[PDB]
Design a binder for this molecule. Structure first.
Ligand SMILES: [Mg+2]
Ligand SMILES: [Mg+2]
Ligand SMILES: [Mg+2]
Ligand SMILES: [Mg+2]
Ligand SMILES: [Mg+2]
Ligand SMILES: [Mg+2]
Ligand SMILES: [Mg+2]
Ligand SMILES: [Mg+2]
Ligand SMILES: [Mg+2]
Lengths: 131, 441, 118
RNA sequence: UACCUGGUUGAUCCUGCCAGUAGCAUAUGCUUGUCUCAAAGAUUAAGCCAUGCAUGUCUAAGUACGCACGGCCGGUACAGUGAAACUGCGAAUGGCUCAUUAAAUCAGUUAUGGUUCCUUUGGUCGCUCGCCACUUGGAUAACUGUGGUAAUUCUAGA
RNA sequence: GGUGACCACGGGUGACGGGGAAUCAGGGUUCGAUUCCGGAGAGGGAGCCUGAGAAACGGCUACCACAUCCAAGGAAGGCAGCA
RNA sequence: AAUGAGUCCACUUUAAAUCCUUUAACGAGGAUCCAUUGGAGGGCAAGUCUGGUGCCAGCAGCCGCGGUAAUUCCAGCUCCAA
RNA sequence: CGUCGCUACUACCGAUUGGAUGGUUUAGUGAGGCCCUCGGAUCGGCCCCGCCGGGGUGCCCUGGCGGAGCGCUG
RNA sequence: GUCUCCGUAGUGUAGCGGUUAUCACGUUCGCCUAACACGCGAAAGGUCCUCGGUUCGAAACCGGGCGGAAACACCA
């Protein structure tokens, strides 16, 4: 199998990231990160490939005042890929999924990180390109 | 050239039906190497790696997600002797009606039986399906079948002679009660996932000499499942009887419209002739006839044909209908019809009035007993008692029935495959019957 | 994807090719179509590599520099035979044309000559 | 065919509308023996389309050394029938639809002495003083051969 | 400077224009997507090669929206033509 | 006595058919080879008929009908319009 | 005749710096084509002329290898 | 096809593995009135969508099938 390695997170609670799928939502506002035990005063932060709980601030009115599971696919914070490559993207992006991992939308705009693609096959299926 | 038959693979859950079917397809020039490589890639991406051969027929998203066969699927592969396309079983009591639909529309049957420790015993039980599939295959009109022994490398020790002999004996002792002759029914030990004893003689299994069958038409004796498929006797195709098509599924293909796919039971279907559907009573003209991505000018009985009818929507004609020629005598709605049900397993008493679900050919419509006419002996239609108050397991009876939902049936004398039906209640098999008389509207 | 002379890169580019550049024949007059073409620099990522030998080596490579294949049909213009056979001016020009002898099994023997032009 | 009738009131004259009446033009319901014409996915979606066809073309009179046939009349450039291909022409007509469009399109009238025009037809083509002309040069098709890609009416080298 | 209560300008149209159609004392009132003429368009825009004639789309290029195949490296689309 | 609507030979038509017109031979006495659609208070032609229902069901473009003797509903008959 | 009480139906106002779908545009970015100014991956001619050659008689009519004139040019 | 929820007098619909009940009506219904109306009196009315399993017995504990009510997929 193989588990995901540690990467630089750079997206704490409260970050507003783009919504890269065609669900009609424009951005995702991160409220928490899955799998975070915690630490006093430490903000839960997420990297690419992490499940987060997010609410959309602008977009279709039927998605706004709800909490959606989301997965980060791109991030601006540079992270190491265990082979000396420090990679970062042009923007922070995520897609809206369910707790089983399948996306609510059907297409993804822009590249998707290899860590996110390898750990979510359903997101990797709809990714136009993988970085 | 080539003659057309049809085969179901029947067996227990998790016994390797879809995997064996798909890998047998792959051996017989079914699909190229890179597409199944992509299928294995997707299976490894999710995790169900061993289900890669199952993905050839289990194409739906739900089936691929759960690793559970839900709906019937079709695939074609040409063999050494003649053409054949294969039916994949769901293998579940949840989709027992899907299984009834699949095995009602068939010529031959493959009884895949697991050989590993534990799975075989779970298959042959009160909660198992190995009894159920064979019993309803005999009920719906499948005469000649084969019993296959799968997952031989799974059992401990692998490739054992004693295990296979025990499996053959245990299957025989009950299939003789079902009705099939084990002398005519071939027994083949196979391994779908490994690809063992499918196309070429085994090298990890030297103890298996070869199965033998003793039929009146012909004697056959081979080493693999492919030659065993080749030696299946051709069915008697009733071409002169009027055209009848129990409908499998409906599809709305872009640019050709709604093309009902069903089996020619009797008669011959050709492009350019008007048809009538029995329950909905809608008349329409057939544009063209095709099968398995290939066109036909004529459709012989025992063939899976897709034909394009004109100016009917997908909602108007749904799964479970009967199609027929309008020029000849067409199938009309059955307001009531008298059938000869034999009670197999039912703990409470059978009175006139309760509602089991009844399965004529493809469809599934629950019916209500109006009154029980005569108590009849177990065979030959021998009259025993007049107007019984109640019935009980282990007895036959002639009964008149009133379906609650619209449904069409035909007599066993005119069209033998239409006459076959079963009865289901209490999530089990409660009666087996055939229809002799029918009233129209 | 074939290579085009003058691309001056390694890899694939897209070029709006009109009539008579390379790697393109127009379906109708005036038609230009954008097509993918490989650059002129050759590297590891090729399938084939057309080469033309400029000068002969010291020995004969088998199957290529032996059993020379003749050009099928000779010149058709009168000057193009006069320069080939060193004619000065109108010396039996009709007869110095090349005659093509063709033989088949059912064919009755016959020689073939071209309609000499100009 | 320049036409009215019922309804406010206990009853009467009015105003006045409602309703009735007749035609055509869309749909729909019922019914339907013959025959002659004949509209027909405009109204909602100028929404989306599988498949198949809808634009190609040679005379004596541009270029045939394809054997793909064939007269040879037999010592000859080319008999002739002609695939393919080059060349020339057509593909800007026809057909469909009515979304846009309110002095815009369009209708009648008038001008281009303010412009262009394939083809047809008719003029003009010795009007010019100025070492191949008994005919000049090169390339490329078709064709042989070596291939590449999973693919295309994709093409490279020789 | 030019145009406006002789209705400019702006908006709407369930507006392509006309020859015409229905109704019919006379006068009129409605309808003309529809075979003839003229115009526009070819999924929405835009830019072009060829050719005498095209801003052509059963020609090309680019973007957008759909959407076909794929061995995922690419390739190919336009029925408001006849069905 | 006369005819078709239909079966149907041939001709004709037509690129080839089809249809029409010809023309053989069958083809009518419930000539069962069966005309329907709407109405019968008024407007508006046609029943103060009969049986049910009983302000219910329903009819009725409008006036209006129906609460146990309905010229208006539901049916039969008989009439009216095309 | 009106208020009040109940039940329906239809619109009106109304915080929500409401919401959705079209249309027209400022500004920024901006594919692609066309034009202009460059550019020169290649393909040809002349000067060929290291030479054998050469004929009107070392003075070539040129029938080919070959360097390359390392220029002039399209 | 795959999942999520709802489905009990005619409706309003409480409910408890030992009881599907009541309420507002709706109706019927003695009760008046020519008829209303207006009040007066009583009732009936439930397979818990439906069929099973579990259980000493279940509407309900569990599971199916049916219909609705939301999605999600569904291309010979
Ligand atoms: Mg703190
Ligand atoms: Mg010439
Ligand atoms: Mg021209
Ligand atoms: Mg318009
Ligand atoms: Mg018009
Ligand atoms: Mg026009
Ligand atoms: Mg145009
Ligand atoms: Mg255009
Ligand atoms: Mg009457």
């Amino acid at each position: 199998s193989g588990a995901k390695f540690r990467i630089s997170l750079g997206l704490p609670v409260g970050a507003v990231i783009n919504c890269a799928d065609n669900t009609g939502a424009k951005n995702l506002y991160i409220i928490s990160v899955k799998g975070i035990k915690g630490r006093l005063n430490r903000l839960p932060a997420a990297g690419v490939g992490d499940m987060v709980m997010a609410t959309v601030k602008k977009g279709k009115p039927e998605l706004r005042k709800k909490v959606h599971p989301a997965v980060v696919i791109r991030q601006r914070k540079s992270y190491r890929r265990k082979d000396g490559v420090f990679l970062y993207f042009e923007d922070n992006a995520g897609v809206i999924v369910n707790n089983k991992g399948e996306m609510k939308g059907s297409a993804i705009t822009g590249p998707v990180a290899k860590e996110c693609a390898d750990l979510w096959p359903r997101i990797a299926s709809n990714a136009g390109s993988i970085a | 050239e080539k003659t057309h038959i049809n085969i179901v693979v029947i067996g227990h859950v998790d016994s390797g039906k879809s995997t064996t079917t798909g890998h047998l397809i792959y051996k017989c020039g079914g699909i190229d190497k890179r597409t199944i490589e992509k299928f294995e890639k997707e299976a490894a991406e999710m995790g169900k790696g061993s289900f890669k051969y199952a993905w050839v027929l289990d194409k739906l998203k739900a089936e691929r997600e759960r690793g559970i066969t839900i709906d019937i699927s079709l695939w074609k592969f040409e063999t050494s002797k003649y053409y054949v396309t294969i039916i994949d079983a769901p293998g579940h009591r949840d989709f027992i009606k899907n299984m009834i639909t699949g095995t009602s529309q068939a010529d031959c049957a493959v009884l895949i039986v697991a050989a590993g420790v534990g799975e075989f015993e779970a298959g042959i039980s009160k909660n198992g399906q190995t009894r159920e599939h064979a019993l309803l295959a005999y009920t719906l009109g499948v005469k000649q079948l084969i019993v296959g022994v799968n997952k031989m490398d799974s059992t401990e020790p692998p490739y054992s002679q004693k295990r296979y002999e025990e499996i053959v004996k245990e299957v025989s002792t009950y299939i003789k009660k079902i009705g099939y002759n084990p002398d005519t029914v071939a027994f083949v030990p196979i391994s779908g996932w490994n690809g063992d004893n499918m196309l070429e003689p085994s090298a990890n299994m030297p103890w298996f000499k070869g199965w033998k069958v003793t039929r009146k038409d012909g004697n056959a004796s081979g080493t693999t499942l492919l030659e065993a498929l080749d030696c299946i006797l051709p069915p008697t195709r009733p071409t002169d009887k009027p055209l009848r098509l129990p409908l499998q599924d409906v599809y709305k293909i872009g640019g050709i419209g709604t093309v009902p796919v069903g089996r020619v039971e009797t008669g011959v279907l050709k492009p350019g002739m008007v048809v009538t559907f029995a329950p909905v009573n809608v008349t329409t003209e057939v544009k063209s006839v095709e099968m398995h991505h290939e066109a036909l000018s004529e459709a012989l009985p025992g063939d899976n044909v897709g034909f394009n009818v004109k100016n009917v929507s997908v909602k108007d004609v749904r799964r479970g209908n009967v199609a027929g020629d309008s020029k000849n005598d067409p199938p009309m709605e059955a307001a009531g019809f008298t059938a000869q049900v034999i009670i197999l397993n039912h703990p409470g008493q059978i009175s006139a009035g309760y509602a089991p679900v009844l399965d004529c050919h493809t469809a599934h419509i629950a019916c209500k007993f109006a009154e029980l006419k005569e108590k009849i002996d177990r065979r030959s239609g021998k009259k025993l008692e007049d107007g019984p108050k109640f019935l009980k397991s282990g007895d036959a009876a002639i009964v008149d029935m009133v379906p609650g939902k619209p449904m069409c049936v035909e007599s066993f004398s005119d069209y033998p495959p239409l006459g076959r039906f079963a009865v289901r209640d209490m999530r089990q098999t409660v009666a087996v019957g055939v229809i002799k008389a029918v009233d129209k509207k | 994807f074939p290579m085009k002379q003058g691309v001056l890169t390694h890899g694939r580019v897209r070029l709006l090719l009109s009539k008579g550049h390379s790697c393109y024949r127009p379906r109708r007059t005036g038609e230009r179509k954008r097509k993918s073409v490989r650059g002129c620099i050759v590297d590891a990522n090729l399938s084939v590599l057309n080469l033309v030998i400029v000068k002969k080596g010291e020995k004969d490579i088998p199957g290529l520099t032996d059993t020379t294949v003749p050009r099928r049909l000779g010149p058709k213009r009168a000057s193009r035979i006069r320069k080939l056979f060193n004619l000065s001016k109108e010396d039996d020009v009709r007869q110095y044309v090349v005659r093509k002898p063709l033989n088949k099994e059912g064919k009755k023997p016959r020689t073939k000559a071209p309609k000499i032009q100009r």
